[PDB]
Amino acid sequence: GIDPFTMPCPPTNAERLHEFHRAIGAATPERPTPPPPELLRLRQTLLDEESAEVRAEIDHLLARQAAGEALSAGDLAPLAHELADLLYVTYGALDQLGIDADAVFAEVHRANLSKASGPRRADGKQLKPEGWRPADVRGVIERLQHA
């Protein structure tokens, strides 16, 4: 069974949040766990704050472009920073719910990539292909509960 020959993928961003939560002493659960209302309100506040910052940075970029400015790659840095902050609190929320963000994201990706294989309307709107199946997030969460 176990011998000296007995014996690991690089961490994902969702895993980084699990590690952060350990570091801040938050003890977040391994499996999906209904939160107290205080936790939901905290998560909402964090989402609102970062969404607002992203929105403000896009607004600032659009304003400069409206003035006739070409933006540089460096001009993108505040927006990139706030988008990454938004990932952090979005992953943060899933991690505090005990829900494996990568498992859920894979399911959403599956349905989105599948939809991308459909044709487009003449106006450019994406249509679904025949046999398309919606993201089954309820099924994902049920699977995560048993292991």
Binding residues for Mg(2+): 50, 53, 82, 85
Calculate the CA 103 to chain-centre distance. 11
Say which entry of a second copy, Gd ion, none residue 53 contacts (CB below 5 to 8 A, set by partner kind): Gd ion
Between 1 and 124, name the residue whose CB sits nearer to a second copy. Answer: 124
CA dihedral 46, 75, 12, 43 (to 10 degrees): 0
Query: Of these, 75, 129, 132, 133, which contacts a second copy (CB under 8 A)?
Result: 75
128 scored as a contact of a second copy (CB under 8 A): no
Site for Gd ion in 26-65 (CB under 5 A): 53
105 scored as a contact of Gd ion (CB under 5 A): no
28 scored as a contact of a second copy (CB under 8 A): no
| Residue (of 86, 92, 105) closest to 40 by Cα position | 92
Classify burial at 136, counting beta carbons within 10 Å of its beta carbon; exposed 0-12, middle 13-18, buried 19 or more: middle
Q: Which residues bind Gd ion (CB under 5 A)?
A: 53, 85
